[PDB]
Design a protein around this nucleic acid. Structure first.
Lengths: 49, 299, 49, 49, 49, 49
DNA sequence: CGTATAATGT
């Protein structure tokens, strides 16, 4: 990720994703996982099981 | 921040391994490798054992990961001592980790020795190789790096004994290295200066500003190259055509490889002694007639 | 003294002599730097007495 | 000749960066220590630049 | 630094190092690109001799 | 490990952006702007910008 | 190039 767009005042990448700088920094430096996409329909369909 | 800190916590996540654990993991991984080897040779492949063999392969791979994770601490404990030598600490740790995987690739438990003793030598080897190849912007051969370190260590010890800095001759006697070789080696040891450093605080002007290009006069080069090369080619053409070929081969105007007197005589079937006279004729001819008028310049 | 302390805490204790302990590289390096680069070591201008 | 009515600055997509490049830099070497010539496919490679 | 760390990652990903190793390497690569495009923007700037 | 696929790193952000759409987000932000919620109104304003 | 007593978090 280009340094200019995150770690900025404001951080353009943060606003685009609506993420605070702390969350965005953690994702960049592999300090914490983040969920990309979850199949909601499949979760609903097999929730009972 | 502090990418070192986050990695240090990550390695600390895994607990240490005991001798019983190390041997058990070593047996598991060896079986996994043997199982993986068996995959490509079971021509009459079994059905249930195939799944069992695959499961063991996953188990062996899991053991390999667990062993590496536990042993990362040794790598850090060895990489710490090389810091401050032109390579970032975290970079050294990664190079050591490469050494760890390499050592584990060849680890054997049948000797009954702890993995730490065998790994330390490889970790050391990998880190020192990395440092030699990468630490310098102008990559020197590993041989030179070892020689430079030898001289630096010898210089320190000799200076302590003498109490005063030693000359090249004294270092040569101590290190058994030729004096000229020492001078060249010292020059290689120099770390290049940076152009961005301001010089003499001269209006905060970087040293690179004052560097003079003083080269690359393409217009001048092209005209001179065209004139001289064409003149010599035309003059050689005016001479005997066979002699023109002799000049090309004796020299290499086309294909390099200046043919010596004996060699060109072999190619033309003549003797080594005839070439001198042939050249004498060529030089005599080139200094008379219109050839001189054209070529009086360029000297 | 930082170097001598490290050497003292690590070097052998039976045959330790101050010559092997005391080092002169840092002092000589320090004094040379002061007279060679310090802003308060200026070329004496000798336009006139 | 010298007609530059306007001047545009925009984010460079990865496809653009490859288009500009005349090659790929694949080695960290800078120059040979004996011939003082740029090394093959290095940071000063004569083939690329 | 960028070229060397990237090459090591290319070699390391092919070898098949554990997850922590590859994650750390990518962190080094991201940091190196961060320093390249702006040094001192984040963290302690990389220093010279 | 069936429905949610959570990656870590700049690669995760890259996949999040490509999956993320802008038309729906823009329309939602514009609708939120029409409403009140001052502090959240200006936050949506900056994001919508 | 594998060096085998052992050596495990800046």
């Amino acid at each position: 990720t280009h340094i200019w767009y995150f770690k900025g005042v404001p951080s353009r990448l943060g606003y685009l994703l609506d993420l605070a700088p702390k969350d965005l920094e953690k994702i960049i430096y592999f300090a914490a996982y983040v969920i990309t996409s979850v199949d909601e329909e499949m979760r609903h369909n097999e929730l009972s099981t | 921040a502090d990418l070192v800190r986050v990695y240090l916590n990550g390695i600390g996540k895994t607990a240490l391994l005991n001798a019983a654990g190390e041997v058990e993991l070593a047996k598991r991984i060896e079986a996994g490798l043997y199982a993986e080897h068996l995959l490509e040779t079971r021509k009459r492949l079994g059905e249930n054992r195939k799944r069992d063999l695959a499961a063991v392969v996953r188990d062996g791979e899991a053991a390999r990961r667990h062993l590496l994770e536990a042993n990362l601490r040794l790598v850090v404990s060895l990489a710490k001592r090389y810091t401050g030598r032109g390579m970032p600490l975290l970079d050294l740790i990664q190079e050591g980790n490469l050494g760890l995987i390499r050592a584990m690739e060849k680890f054997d438990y049948t000797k009954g020795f702890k993995f730490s003793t065998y790994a330390t030598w490889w970790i050391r080897q990998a880190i020192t190789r990395g440092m030699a190849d990468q630490s310098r912007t102008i990559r020197l051969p590993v041989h030179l790096v070892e020689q430079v370190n030898k001289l630096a260590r010898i210089k320190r010890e000799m200076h302590q004994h003498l109490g005063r800095e030693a000359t090249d001759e004294e270092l040569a006697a101590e290190s058994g290295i030729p004096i000229d070789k020492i001078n060249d080696l010292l020059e290689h040891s120099r770390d290049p200066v940076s152009l961005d450093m301001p010089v003499g605080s001269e209006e905060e002007a970087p040293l690179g500003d004052f560097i003079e290009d003083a080269e690359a006069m393409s217009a001048e080069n092209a005209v001179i190259a065209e004139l001289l090369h064409t003149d010599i080619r035309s003059v050689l053409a005016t001479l005997d055509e066979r002699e023109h070929q002799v000049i090309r081969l004796r020299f290499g105007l086309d294909d390099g490889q200046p043919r010596t007197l004996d060699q060109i005589g072999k190619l033309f079937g003549l003797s080594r002694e005839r070439v001198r006279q042939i050249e004498r004729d060529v030089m005599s001819k080139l200094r008379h007639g219109e050839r001189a008028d054209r070529l009086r310049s360029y000297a | 003294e930082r170097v001598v302390r490290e050497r003292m805490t690590t070097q052998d204790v039976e045959a330790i002599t101050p010559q092997t302990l005391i080092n002169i590289r840092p002092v000589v390096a320090a004094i040379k730097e002061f007279f060679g680069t310090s802003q308060l070591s200026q070329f004496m201008d000798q336009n006139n007495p | 000749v010298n007609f530059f009515d306007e001047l545009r600055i925009g984010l460079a997509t990865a496809e653009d960066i490859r288009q500009w490049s005349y090659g790929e830099v694949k080695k960290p070497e800078t120059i040979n220590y004996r011939t003082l010539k740029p090394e093959k496919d290095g940071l000063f490679c004569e083939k690329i630049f | 630094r960028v070229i060397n760390r990237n090459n090591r990652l290319k070699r390391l990903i092919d070898l098949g190092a554990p997850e922590i190793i590859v994650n750390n390497e990518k962190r080094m690569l991201q940091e190196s690109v961060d320093a390249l495009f702006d040094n001192g923007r984040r963290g302690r700037p990389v220093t010279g001799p | 490990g069936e429905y949610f696929t959570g990656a870590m790193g700049a690669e995760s952000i890259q996949k999040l952006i490509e999956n993320f759409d802008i038309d729906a987000e823009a329309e939602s932000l514009r609708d939120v702007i029409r409403n009140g919620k001052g502090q959240k109104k200006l936050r949506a304003l900056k994001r919508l910008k």
